[PDB]
Amino acid sequence: CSPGIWQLDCTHLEGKVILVAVHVASGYIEAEVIPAETGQETAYFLLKLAGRWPVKTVHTDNGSNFTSTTVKTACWWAGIKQEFGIESMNKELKKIIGQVRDQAEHLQTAVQMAVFIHNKKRKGGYSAGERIVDIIATDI
């Protein structure tokens, strides 16, 4: 699929919220533990993502995630569209979080350790972190 398509959803763990972005073409992920599910936090994450990758469109599993004017303003400013109307990651990620959870005091540390492990793991046969960079560089 197109190199500009992203998936953005939130999951819950230990009473906290984890924001999870997936680059659909590569399987690369970025993730953050956020205070709670707020439009303001979603908007921040979108702006950071867009300043780093060529983000064209973002899909989500919960469309109400994007209804706040803060989110719509971020998407407007960054030139991002949404699709009005991947699972192997959110499973794998929570699996990897589980494996490393006791090795870190704060969930946020375990989450970033798990993202690192996911993006560097070679499946075949590049890693997801290698694929995204190769896909983006190629499209240039």
Add this chain to the structure above:
Amino acid sequence: CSPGIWQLDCTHLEGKVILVAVHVASGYIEAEVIPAETGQETAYFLLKLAGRWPVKTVHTDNGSNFTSTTVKTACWWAGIKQEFGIESMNKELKKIIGQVRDQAEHLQTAVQMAVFIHNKKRKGGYSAGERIVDIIATDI
């Protein structure tokens, strides 16, 4: 220079702390407004950075920035070394922040807008965001 060298420093603005990472070979930046200058926040940012890019070494302008065991543990786990013993960005970035500051309520929004503007600006003649991806993909 080598594609694995990063620069990480903190600057201050409006009573808040901005963490600024620069990919030395490309001029690409990532930045975050953080509560205050804490080892814990530095460690989080390092782990996120490392899960996304092939980070080998990080330089800083304030070596005491890296003395907390939290930071040393993050660097240990991610395989990152520091150099025991770029300015055009921190100037340009605060300049760009200034230009957009009134267009956003929170400094954190202005910071991400400024990072976006910096990484997408074409100097010549790719943008910094294009250069980093091309440098990393090539080194694969």
